[PDB]
Amino acid sequence: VDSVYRTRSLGVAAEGIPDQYADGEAARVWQLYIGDTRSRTAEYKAWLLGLLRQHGCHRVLDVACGTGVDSIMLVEEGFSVTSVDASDKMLKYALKERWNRRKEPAFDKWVIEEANWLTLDKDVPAGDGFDAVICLGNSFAHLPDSKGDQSEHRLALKNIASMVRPGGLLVIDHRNYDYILSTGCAPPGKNIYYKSDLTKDITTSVLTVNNKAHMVTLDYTVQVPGAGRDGAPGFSKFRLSYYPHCLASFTELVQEAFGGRCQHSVLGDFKPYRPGQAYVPCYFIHVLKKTG
Amino acid sequence: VDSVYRTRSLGVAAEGIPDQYADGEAARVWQLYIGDTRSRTAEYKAWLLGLLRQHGCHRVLDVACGTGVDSIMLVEEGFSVTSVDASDKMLKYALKERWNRRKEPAFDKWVIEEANWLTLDKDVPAGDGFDAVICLGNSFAHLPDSKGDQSEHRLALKNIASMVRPGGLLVIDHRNYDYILSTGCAPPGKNIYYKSDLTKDITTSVLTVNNKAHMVTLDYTVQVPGAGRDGAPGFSKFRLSYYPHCLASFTELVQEAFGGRCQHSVLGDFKPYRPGQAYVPCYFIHVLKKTG
Amino acid sequence: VDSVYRTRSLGVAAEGIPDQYADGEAARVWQLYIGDTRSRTAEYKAWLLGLLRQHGCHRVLDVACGTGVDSIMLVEEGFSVTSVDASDKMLKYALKERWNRRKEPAFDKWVIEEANWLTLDKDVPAGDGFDAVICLGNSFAHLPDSKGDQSEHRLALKNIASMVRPGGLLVIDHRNYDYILSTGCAPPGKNIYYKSDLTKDITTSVLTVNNKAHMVTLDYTVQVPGAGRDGAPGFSKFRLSYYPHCLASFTELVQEAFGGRCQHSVLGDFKPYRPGQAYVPCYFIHVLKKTG
Amino acid sequence: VDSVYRTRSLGVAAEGIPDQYADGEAARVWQLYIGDTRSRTAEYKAWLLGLLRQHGCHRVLDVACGTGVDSIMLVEEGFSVTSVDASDKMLKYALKERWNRRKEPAFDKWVIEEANWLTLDKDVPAGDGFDAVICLGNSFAHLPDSKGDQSEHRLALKNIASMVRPGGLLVIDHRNYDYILSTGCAPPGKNIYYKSDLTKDITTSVLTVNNKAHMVTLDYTVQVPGAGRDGAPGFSKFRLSYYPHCLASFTELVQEAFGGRCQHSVLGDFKPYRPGQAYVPCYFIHVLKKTG
Ligand SMILES: C[S@@+](CC[C@H](N)C(=O)[O-])C[C@H]1O[C@@H](n2cnc3c(N)ncnc32)[C@H](O)[C@@H]1O
Ligand SMILES: C[S@@+](CC[C@H](N)C(=O)[O-])C[C@H]1O[C@@H](n2cnc3c(N)ncnc32)[C@H](O)[C@@H]1O
Ligand SMILES: C[S@@+](CC[C@H](N)C(=O)[O-])C[C@H]1O[C@@H](n2cnc3c(N)ncnc32)[C@H](O)[C@@H]1O
Ligand SMILES: C[S@@+](CC[C@H](N)C(=O)[O-])C[C@H]1O[C@@H](n2cnc3c(N)ncnc32)[C@H](O)[C@@H]1O
C-alpha cells in the first residue's frame, strides 16, 4: 500500500518557519494583486458616500472586510464601522493598518473580527442591527455551491440580511456573469472600484455540470515589473474561482433573504439599470432597504 | 494524459471564505494544543527573570515569538521587548493579545514583527544589538536540514548571534535528543516551561539517512474532553517534525556562530549540567554571553 | 518547511505487491464497466464486416485495441489483424484472450503490440500499408489537447493516415459532441456498438476556456448488483474525460491528415448522414478511402 | 472548500493513451533497473539447480515471479513451473517471453498467473502441493507491515507454506537487515544472484517508530549511459521500500508458518551460516523442508 509521510499536518504551524504555502510563486503574485486594490475610484467614493449620507447611515458592517480598503475609508469619514472576514491572510493587513493608526481615535474605535457568512448571526452581535451592511467587489461570488442546490448561498445571504436594522440598507454586488457566460471572456481590468496599475492577462474557464454553470475560474497572469534582466518584467500566475451569479437568480435570492420585505434597486456601473439598455455593466450593485 | 484543476492556487486567500487548511481536523486539535499549553511554570518565570536581571538586561529580542507567551511575561515585568516570528498563523495570537491589552502602557510599547532566522539581519534593526536574545521552547529544532549539510542551521544561528550586543546574552535551548535517539521515545508532557492540562499520547518516528539521524517526527493524539457521546472524550491527531540536535554538535554549532568570541554554559533543566550526572534533563538550555 | 516522503516512486512496481492504483474502488467498478460492456451488437458486426469485405480488405490495423473486442471479431472472421494500444492495463485483456485461444490457428497469428498514435510510425511497420485502419468506439476523443492548438490531434491523425495503403480505408468515429455541448448531457447507454447490461448514471461536465469547449468529463455511477445488504445493489463511481470533437472541425482535421487526397463519407449511426436530418446520431463514423 | 478535479480516476485506463504514471522519469529508470536483472550468477544457477536436483524436485511454484528470470531458467531446465506475482507491470515481461518462445513446448506448458501472498491459498490450486516453492531475491521484504503487528507477514508466510507438498521445500530469502540496521548503509551492487552492469548510488533511510525499525527506503540514483551531450551518461532516481527482516525474527516467523513441523537451514551467501563467523553475508537464504 503506498504511504505518503508529511513533515507536518496540513494546517499546523510552528515557531521559526513560514506557514505552509506562504512563499510559493502563486502567493507572491497574489500579494501584489491584493495590494493593487489601492487606488479607489472617484466614482466609487462619490457613490458610496453619497448613498450612505442620504440615508443617515452611521453604524456600518463591512462583511467582506479583506485588507480593509473599504472599511478604512468609512472610518476616515467618521462612520462607526465593524469589519469582519473569514480569511486570516487578508485580515492580517487590516489589523496592521489599525495598529499603525492606533493613535488616531477613530482607528482605535474600529472593530475588526473574524466571522463567516454561514455562521454570521452567532459570530457578530447584531445589537439593534446596523444601518448599512456592505458586501462589495464580488466578494460574495467567491462562495461556492458545494451542496449543488444553492442552500449555502441562501443561508449566508439570510444571515447577512439579518444584520440590517429595519429601515437599514444592504449594498451587495456581483460581476456581470450574464456577459461572462455568453463571450467566455472575463476581460482584464475594466474596473469601476480601484484603478489597477498592474497589467494582467485573464483566461476564463467556465465549468457547466449537466446544463448548469457551476463555476468561473480565472487564471491571472501578472506582469511583475522589476523581475527580469535589464529592468524587464517577469510574469507569474495565480488562480481564483467563483459562482456565476446571474442577475435574475441573484435578484430572487437576495429578495428571498429579506422574505420579500425589502425595496430593491439594481445599478449598472454606478448608474441605473434598465434591462435592455445598450451599456453592459461590469458589475451589478443591488441596494436593498429592509421595509419591515 | 492526466491533469489536475484546483479551485484556487495553493497559498491564495479570498474575502468570502476560510483560508486553505484552516478548519481541518488537524488544525483544530492543534489550536487546542497551542492554547492549553501556554500556562507557564513558576520555575521558568523565576529562572528566566533572575538571569536577565542578574546581567542587567533591559532590551530583549524574542526571536521565536509564537503566540507571545514568553514575550508577554517580559513585557509585563517592564522589559523593552521586540518579538519576531516567521509564522503568521502563530503571530496572530500575540497580535490579538497586544490589542486587547493596548491600554496598559507597556503593551502599547511591545513590538511584534514578522522575521525569519535566515534573513533576520535584513528584517530586524539591531542597531547596536539587543541585551538578550531568547529562542526558548525548543523552537530552533523546527528548522529542517534541507541541504544535508547543516548550512541553514549555521546561517540562522549566525544571524541570531549578530543581534546580540557585545556583553549581551543568547539564551537558546533544545530538547534532549541524545536520549530520544537512544530510547526512540520522546515521552509526553515532562515539560519544564509550561503546565499542560491536556492528555496526549506521542508516537516518535526517527528518520536516519546513510547513518545520520535526520529528523524526529511526533504524532500527537490529543484526547479532546467533550467531543464524544455521554460527555466522553473525542480524539484527534496532528503531526509535527524536529531536527534532532545532539548536545555536542549543537554546542559546537552555537559557538561557531559567535566566531568563538563567547562564553558558553549549558543548563540541565534549570540546574547546571555536567556529563554523566545522574539527572537526565528534558531540555538543554544554552546561555552564551558574547565577548566581542 | 514541508517535505513529502512516499514508499516508492510513482510508476514503479515490485514483486511482493499490487501495483499502485490497482485495487482502488474506482479501478474495481471500472473493471466491471470494461467487462460488462464488451458484448457486441449484430448491427455493428454486420456493418463493419460488410464494409471491409465490400472493399476487399484483408490486412487490418486496429489502432485502438483496448481489450481486443474489435480485433477478436475480425481475427475470428479470418482477417490478418494487428492490434496496438498505448494502455498496458487494457492490452492485458487482449493478450490474455490470445493466450487462451492460442490453439485456434487464427488466434496464433494475431499480433498485439504496444504503440501510441503520436509515435505510431516509429512503432508499427506499415510496409506498404494496411488495407483498413480502424479506431472505433470513440477512442480518438481520449487524447486531450494539451498545448491549446490541436497540434497533438493533427500529429496523431497524420500518423494514423500514414498506415493506410493507397486505396485502403480509415474508419474512425466520435461521439456526437455537437449535441452533448448543447444539451450538456451525454445520456447513458444509447450505444450502437455494444449491448450494456449494467445500469449507470452519468454527470457530464463541460470545461470551456476563453470560449472553446475544451473537455467533457463523465462521472459514471455504476450500480453494482450484489454489493449491499439483502442482495441490494452497492454503488461506485469513476471518471473519465474526452475531447469534444464537433463534426465540422473533425471533418476538417481528418481530411487534412490525408493531405486532401482522400474520399470521405460520414455515417449517421450506421446509416448515411445528411445535415438537418431528423435522426440524431449518437456516433458519427467517418470512412475515408485514401486516394494517393 | 478547495476542490481538486482529476481528468480521470486513479487506476482507470483508456484506449489511445499511456496509463497514469508509465513514462515518468522514475518509471523510465526503474525499467532499466528491472532489465538489468539479466546476468545470473554461476553460483546462483549452480546452487539452486543442485538443491532442487538433489531433492528430486519437479513441480515448482515461483511465488515472486517478476519479469520471469528465475522461472525462465527452471522451464529451460525441464521443471514444470507455475509462476505467480501480484504485480501486472512485472508480469507483462514474463508473459511476453512465454509468447515469444511459445513454439518451444516447455514454454507452452509454463503457467503464469496473478496471485497475492495474502490470498494465495485461493488464488493458486495447491493440487497435491508443489515440490519446491521459491521466493528469492528479497521479494518478500517488499511487503510492509501495515497493521504494526506483523499479522500480514504471518498470513502471507502461512499461505506460502501451504503450497509445499509434505516432504517438499520452501526456499525463501531476505537481505541482511542486521548489517544494514547497524552501518545505515545498504552498499550498492554486492549482489550474489545477477551481476549488475549499471552503476547506481544508494542512499538508505531507516525509519524507526517508537523503538522498532519499521522500514528501509532506498533511493537508487542510476547512471544512464547515453543520455548527456558527447556520449556522457545521465543520472536519474527512483525509490523503493522494505520491511527490515532480522535473521532471528524471520527464522521464528518462517518456522511458525510450518507450525514447527519443518527442518530449517540458513545459508550465508550461497554457503553455510555459522552465527559468529567472520563473513557477513549480503543475503540469508532459508531452506525449509516440510517434515509433516
Ligand atoms: C479584492 S476584491 C475587492 C475587495 C473590496 N474592497 C471589499 O470590500 O470586499 C477584487 C474582486 O474583483 C474581482 N473581478 C471580477 N472580474 C474581474 C476582472 N476581470 N479582473 C479583475 N478583478 C475582477 C476579483 O475576482 C475579486 O473578487
Ligand atoms: C506552545 S509551544 C512553546 C512556544 C514558546 N513560547 C516559544 O518560545 O516558541 C510547545 C512546545 O513544546 C514542545 N514539546 C517538545 N517535546 C514535547 C513533549 N514531549 N511534550 C510536550 N510538548 C513538547 C513542542 O514541540 C512545542 O514546540
Ligand atoms: C469498452 S469501451 C469501447 C472499446 C472499443 N473496443 C475500442 O475500439 O476502443 C466503451 C466506450 O464507450 C464509450 N461511451 C461514450 N459515451 C458513452 C455513454 N453515454 N454510455 C456508454 N458508453 C459510452 C466510452 O467512452 C468508452 O470509450
Ligand atoms: C528484481 S529483485 C530479484 C527478482 C528475482 N529474480 C525473483 O525471483 O523474485 C531485486 C531485489 O534486490 C534488492 N536488493 C537488496 N539490497 C540491494 C542493493 N544494495 N542493491 C540492489 N539490489 C538490492 C532489491 O531491493 C530487490 O528487492
PDB file of N, CA and C in Angstrom, chain B residues 202-228:
ATOM      1  N   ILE B 202       2.149  10.280  22.388  1.00  0.00           N
ATOM      2  CA  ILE B 202       3.054  10.609  21.301  1.00  0.00           C
ATOM      3  C   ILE B 202       3.740   9.366  20.732  1.00  0.00           C
ATOM      4  N   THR B 203       3.651   9.155  19.411  1.00  0.00           N
ATOM      5  CA  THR B 203       4.414   8.168  18.656  1.00  0.00           C
ATOM      6  C   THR B 203       5.615   8.911  18.102  1.00  0.00           C
ATOM      7  N   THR B 204       6.845   8.421  18.157  1.00  0.00           N
ATOM      8  CA  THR B 204       8.006   9.187  17.780  1.00  0.00           C
ATOM      9  C   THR B 204       8.546   8.393  16.630  1.00  0.00           C
ATOM     10  N   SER B 205       8.893   8.979  15.510  1.00  0.00           N
ATOM     11  CA  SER B 205       9.485   8.284  14.398  1.00  0.00           C
ATOM     12  C   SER B 205      10.831   8.906  14.175  1.00  0.00           C
ATOM     13  N   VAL B 206      11.887   8.167  13.985  1.00  0.00           N
ATOM     14  CA  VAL B 206      13.169   8.781  13.812  1.00  0.00           C
ATOM     15  C   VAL B 206      13.616   8.393  12.384  1.00  0.00           C
ATOM     16  N   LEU B 207      13.982   9.363  11.576  1.00  0.00           N
ATOM     17  CA  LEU B 207      14.437   9.077  10.204  1.00  0.00           C
ATOM     18  C   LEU B 207      15.938   9.237  10.175  1.00  0.00           C
ATOM     19  N   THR B 208      16.577   8.214   9.702  1.00  0.00           N
ATOM     20  CA  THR B 208      18.032   8.158   9.656  1.00  0.00           C
ATOM     21  C   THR B 208      18.474   7.940   8.168  1.00  0.00           C
ATOM     22  N   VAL B 209      19.270   8.891   7.582  1.00  0.00           N
ATOM     23  CA  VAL B 209      19.723   8.728   6.138  1.00  0.00           C
ATOM     24  C   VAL B 209      21.261   8.743   5.952  1.00  0.00           C
ATOM     25  N   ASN B 210      21.657   7.543   5.483  1.00  0.00           N
ATOM     26  CA  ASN B 210      23.038   6.986   5.431  1.00  0.00           C
ATOM     27  C   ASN B 210      23.809   7.515   6.616  1.00  0.00           C
ATOM     28  N   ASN B 211      23.320   6.852   7.641  1.00  0.00           N
ATOM     29  CA  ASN B 211      23.681   6.852   9.061  1.00  0.00           C
ATOM     30  C   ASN B 211      23.931   8.218   9.692  1.00  0.00           C
ATOM     31  N   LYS B 212      22.852   8.961   9.736  1.00  0.00           N
ATOM     32  CA  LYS B 212      22.734  10.241  10.470  1.00  0.00           C
ATOM     33  C   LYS B 212      21.250  10.450  10.750  1.00  0.00           C
ATOM     34  N   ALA B 213      20.948  10.596  12.030  1.00  0.00           N
ATOM     35  CA  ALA B 213      19.595  10.961  12.482  1.00  0.00           C
ATOM     36  C   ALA B 213      19.258  12.243  11.782  1.00  0.00           C
ATOM     37  N   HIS B 214      18.207  12.251  11.052  1.00  0.00           N
ATOM     38  CA  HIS B 214      17.972  13.382  10.212  1.00  0.00           C
ATOM     39  C   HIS B 214      16.718  14.119  10.566  1.00  0.00           C
ATOM     40  N   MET B 215      15.849  13.456  11.283  1.00  0.00           N
ATOM     41  CA  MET B 215      14.555  14.037  11.623  1.00  0.00           C
ATOM     42  C   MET B 215      13.855  13.145  12.639  1.00  0.00           C
ATOM     43  N   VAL B 216      13.152  13.786  13.563  1.00  0.00           N
ATOM     44  CA  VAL B 216      12.278  13.113  14.539  1.00  0.00           C
ATOM     45  C   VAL B 216      10.864  13.646  14.278  1.00  0.00           C
ATOM     46  N   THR B 217       9.905  12.752  14.136  1.00  0.00           N
ATOM     47  CA  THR B 217       8.509  13.160  13.915  1.00  0.00           C
ATOM     48  C   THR B 217       7.637  12.711  15.080  1.00  0.00           C
ATOM     49  N   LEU B 218       6.849  13.652  15.602  1.00  0.00           N
ATOM     50  CA  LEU B 218       5.939  13.372  16.673  1.00  0.00           C
ATOM     51  C   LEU B 218       4.530  13.370  16.148  1.00  0.00           C
ATOM     52  N   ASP B 219       3.775  12.294  16.344  1.00  0.00           N
ATOM     53  CA  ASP B 219       2.347  12.276  16.093  1.00  0.00           C
ATOM     54  C   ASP B 219       1.649  12.386  17.416  1.00  0.00           C
ATOM     55  N   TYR B 220       0.906  13.481  17.562  1.00  0.00           N
ATOM     56  CA  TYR B 220       0.185  13.791  18.787  1.00  0.00           C
ATOM     57  C   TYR B 220      -1.249  13.268  18.750  1.00  0.00           C
ATOM     58  N   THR B 221      -1.680  12.441  19.712  1.00  0.00           N
ATOM     59  CA  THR B 221      -3.071  12.033  19.783  1.00  0.00           C
ATOM     60  C   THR B 221      -3.625  12.753  20.954  1.00  0.00           C
ATOM     61  N   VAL B 222      -4.424  13.744  20.680  1.00  0.00           N
ATOM     62  CA  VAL B 222      -4.961  14.567  21.726  1.00  0.00           C
ATOM     63  C   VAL B 222      -6.357  14.055  22.057  1.00  0.00           C
ATOM     64  N   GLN B 223      -6.524  13.867  23.350  1.00  0.00           N
ATOM     65  CA  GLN B 223      -7.800  13.476  23.909  1.00  0.00           C
ATOM     66  C   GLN B 223      -8.623  14.758  23.992  1.00  0.00           C
ATOM     67  N   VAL B 224      -9.685  14.923  23.238  1.00  0.00           N
ATOM     68  CA  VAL B 224     -10.467  16.124  23.372  1.00  0.00           C
ATOM     69  C   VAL B 224     -11.756  16.012  24.230  1.00  0.00           C
ATOM     70  N   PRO B 225     -11.770  16.615  25.461  1.00  0.00           N
ATOM     71  CA  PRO B 225     -12.635  16.314  26.602  1.00  0.00           C
ATOM     72  C   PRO B 225     -14.131  16.249  26.528  1.00  0.00           C
ATOM     73  N   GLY B 226     -14.766  16.854  25.515  1.00  0.00           N
ATOM     74  CA  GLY B 226     -16.203  16.658  25.451  1.00  0.00           C
ATOM     75  C   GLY B 226     -16.726  16.263  24.085  1.00  0.00           C
ATOM     76  N   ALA B 227     -15.942  15.649  23.222  1.00  0.00           N
ATOM     77  CA  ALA B 227     -16.385  15.562  21.851  1.00  0.00           C
ATOM     78  C   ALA B 227     -17.236  14.359  21.568  1.00  0.00           C
ATOM     79  N   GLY B 228     -17.221  13.327  22.429  1.00  0.00           N
ATOM     80  CA  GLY B 228     -17.917  12.062  22.165  1.00  0.00           C
ATOM     81  C   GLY B 228     -19.363  12.076  22.663  1.00  0.00           C
TER      82      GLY B 228
END
